[PDB]
Amino acid sequence: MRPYEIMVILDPTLDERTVAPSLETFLNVIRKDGGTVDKVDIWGRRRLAYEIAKHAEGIYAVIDVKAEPATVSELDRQLNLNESVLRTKVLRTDKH
Amino acid sequence: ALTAEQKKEILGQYGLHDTDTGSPEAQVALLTKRIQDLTEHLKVHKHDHHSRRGLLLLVGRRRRLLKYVAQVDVARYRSLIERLGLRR
Amino acid sequence: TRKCVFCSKKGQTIDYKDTALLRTYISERGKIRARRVTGNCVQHQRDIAVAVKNAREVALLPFGS
Amino acid sequence: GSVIKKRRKRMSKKKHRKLLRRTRVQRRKLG
Amino acid sequence: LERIAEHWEARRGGVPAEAGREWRHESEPARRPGYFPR
Amino acid sequence: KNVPHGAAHIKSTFNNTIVSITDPQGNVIAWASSGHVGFKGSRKSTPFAAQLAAENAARKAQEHGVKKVDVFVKGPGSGRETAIRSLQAAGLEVGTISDVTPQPHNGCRPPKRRR
RNA sequence: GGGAGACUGGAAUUCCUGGUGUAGCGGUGGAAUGCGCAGAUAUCAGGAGGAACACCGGUGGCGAAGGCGGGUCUCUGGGCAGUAACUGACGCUGAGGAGCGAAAGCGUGGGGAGCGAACAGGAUUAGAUACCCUGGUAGUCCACGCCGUAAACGGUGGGUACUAGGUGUGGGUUUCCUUCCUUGGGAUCCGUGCCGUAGCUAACGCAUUAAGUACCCCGCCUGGGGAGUACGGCCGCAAGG
């Protein structure tokens, strides 16, 4: 169970009020998998440096998660399949 | 390489007493575990030649340690060979 | 010459999230500044370059505006 | 060392390779 | 006669080339501003 | 038409220079080339030819109603400053100068070196 | 930037589509082949694809060598420092042998943007099977295998001990100026450069990273051509080694 930091960008079209529940049900895969803990932080509605997928603004979200490598890859795979997620990136907050 | 708990368990099992880590028995057991892990890894990454060189180095070191243990005392050599499932 | 502001006892950690801390390390063209101009140590220079690249990858810094 | 020796060796090698190329099928048929 | 040729093929290797690479007697001198670069 | 504010694009290569005054939406309304003003061969890489092309393009923009322009220079330096100066001198107000030269991030292989 | 796998980013080149838009563009020492007038080059928007990863980035890091830098994640090798807990000479070298080994090349299957052997024209020339220009196929890329060579060079085999110093730089431990911010400075261990003693060398130079002083083991040399060739053999699909 290694600690991870996940940053996602959601298209600004959707309301910021539904972002928190939508991520919350997304992280249910990591939660029920292996007794894993998240700390979701949202600072959205920022214009991007360059245009992404025909979009200039984006909603930024930072997720801090402690889970197994297989679990996190599963969450990352699911997030990219969803169309409301423009981009995502997984970091290891360990020494790496 | 192995984690601290695997090393602790192997050393407790094969060690001559509860403190030794440099006995040929303990060294050979740890090398055998490392070599098995490396062989499993190389079964997937066939083209990882750099790690294969390290595998060869470990194999040579274990062979030398076994040579020493056989020359010192043959009974210990036989016991170690039978316990670790090695050929030579 | 100059000071590695990160080796000091107050050296802030280098992250790809804090944009301003990186913006101070790139030139007006968006290029990464050299080590001799900046003055930080080799490890911190590598950390800065990696953080800048990561920030660019998530559209926090322009790719050479 | 002077490159003259390298030049002599390279000319010998080049001539031999040319000779080998000129008689490839003949050598194959005789061997 | 070989050394005298003086047509283009005989003087194409001696004509200065590049912009800053290599220097020759007839190479074009670099243009310099009035103020020191700094 | 009547386009009061437009954009000027100058492309200065090593053997030519092309000026095209452009409507800010990207449409070209008047263009002049180094070979369009009577130069050919190596003659058209000279700064004087760049000046002539810039002046011709500036005039052809001016009767179209273009009064103020911003330039986007590009290419190895041959007549860029001369072209901008001739743009100004032909009765055109030059707002901003921007160098937009395509800079690859190490992609594609350059041709082999000449000898 | 040690290696392997998977996923992924942006700039640029090319092409395709649609606007604006005209008569040149392209290329050179100078031109011509070439492209365009059936709408080119230029400019804008959109799309497809492949390859390489600007700045960071150096005589800086890692690797036995070949070599290795876009980002992330997974798996994995080695090194160094300190403590010195453990074993107690278990070391070194290594004929043969085995493995790895740039590029080119070869086989099977994909891919193919740019570059580009061969090949076509143009030009230069007395002649151009070339240099320069316009095109351009293998190849370059990927998967799995062959090949086994390089100025594969530090043209310097490996291990060990000793022999003035000075000064850069990378990694780590520590005492004292102490603000403790500071390459403060020192000491120490491990690297990597430059300059320089003694000594060595035909000389050039090397010089604590030895080409100095010695010990152990291995490879190799015995005038130049003929020739790393013939013959025989082994390996290879072949090239060939």
Numbering used by the authors:
A (entry chain g): 1 to 96
B (entry chain p): 2 to 89
C (entry chain s): 17 to 81
D (entry chain v): 2 to 32
E (entry chain w): 89 to 126
F (entry chain l): 23 to 137
Manuscript text:
Ribosome hibernation is a key survival strategy bacteria adopt under environmental stress, where a protein, hibernation promotion factor (HPF), transitorily inactivates the ribosome. Mycobacterium tuberculosis encounters hypoxia (low oxygen) as a major stress in the host macrophages, and upregulates the expression of RafH protein, which is crucial for its survival. The RafH, a dual domain HPF, an orthologue of bacterial long HPF (HPFlong), hibernates ribosome in 70S monosome form, whereas in other bacteria, the HPFlong induces 70S ribosome dimerization and hibernates its ribosome in 100S disome form. The RafH binding would block all known critical sites of translation initiation: the decoding center, the a-SD sequence of 16S rRNA, and the bS1 protein at the platform binding center of the ribosomal small subunit.
Multi-body refinement further improved the map quality and resolution to 2.7 Å and 2.9 Å for the LSU and SSU, respectively. RafH NTD binds to the cleft between the head and body of the SSU to a similar binding site reported for HPFlong NTD, HPFshort, and YfiA in ribosome structures. The positively charged side chain residues K21, R24, and R28 of the helix α1 make electrostatic interaction with the backbone phosphate of the h44 of 16S rRNA, residues G1478, U1479, C1480, and G1481. The arginine-rich patch of α2 composed of R84, R88, and R91 interacts with C1382, C1383, and G1384 of the 16S rRNA. Similarly, the residues R37, R39 of β2 strand, residue Q55 of β3, and R66 of β4 forms a positively charged patch that stacks against U947 and G948 of h31 of the 16S rRNA. The W96, which harbors in the mini helix α3, makes stacking interaction with the G673 of h23. The linker residues between W111 to F124 extensively interact with the nucleotide stretch, A1518 to C1522, which harbors the anti-Shine Dalgarno region of the 16S rRNA. This remarkable interaction involves residue W111 making a stacking interaction with the A1518 of 16S rRNA. The RafH CTD binds to the mRNA ‘platform binding center (PBC)’ composed of proteins bS1, uS7, uS11, and bS18 with 16S rRNA helices h26, h40, and 23S rRNA helix H54a. The small subunit of 70S ribosome in the RafH ribosome structure adopts an unrotated closed conformation in our in-vitro reconstituted 70S ribosome RafH complex.
